[PDB]
Design a protein around this ligand. Structure first.
Ligand SMILES: CCOC(=O)N1CCOCC1
Length: 119
C-alpha cells in the first residue's frame, strides 16, 4: 500500500530498458536530419530519455502518466513505419511486450495503494 513505490519501480524498469539492445532507436529523440519528414507524420515525439528526465524531475504524478508516454514511443514507431516488417518497428514490438509485462504489477500496486488510501 505504498503510494510512492511506483517511482523507484519505474526507474529500475527504465534502467532495464536502456540495457536492452531493442531500445537503441528509442533512447533519444528521433533525428530530423536522418528522418526529414518525421514531424509531418508524428505530432508528439517521445523517447526514453525524455521519459526518464520527466520522472527524475518529479513531473509524473502517477505511473499511468509514465505508461501513456512510453506507449506513445511505440505508437509513434507504428505510425512512422513504412512496413510492419521494418527493423525498427520490429524492435518496438519486442520492447513493448517487455515493457507491458513489467509495468502491469507497477500499475496494479499503485492503484491498489491509492484505493487503500481512499478507503
Ligand atoms: C520503423 C519505425 O521507425 C521508428 O520507429 N523510428 C524510431 C525513431 O526514429 C525514427 C525511426
Amino acid at each position: 500500500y505504498d503510494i510512492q513505490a511506483w517511482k523507484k519501480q519505474c526507474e529500475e524498469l527504465l534502467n532495464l530498458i536502456f540495457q536492452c539492445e531493442d531500445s537503441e532507436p528509442f533512447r533519444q529523440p528521433v533525428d530530423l536530419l536522418e528522418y526529414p519528414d518525421y514531424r509531418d507524420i508524428i505530432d508528439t515525439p517521445m523517447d526514453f530519455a525524455t521519459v526518464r528526465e520527466t520522472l527524475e524531475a518529479g513531473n509524473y504524478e502517477s505511473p499511468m502518466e509514465l505508461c501513456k508516454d512510453v506507449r506513445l514511443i511505440f505508437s509513434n514507431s507504428k505510425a512512422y513505419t513504412p512496413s510492419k516488417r521494418s527493423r525498427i518497428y520490429s524492435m518496438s514490438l519486442r520492447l513493448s511486450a517487455f515493457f507491458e509485462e513489467h509495468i502491469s504489477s507497477v500499475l496494479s500496486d499503485y492503484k491498489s495503494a491509492l484505493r487503500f488510501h481512499k478507503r
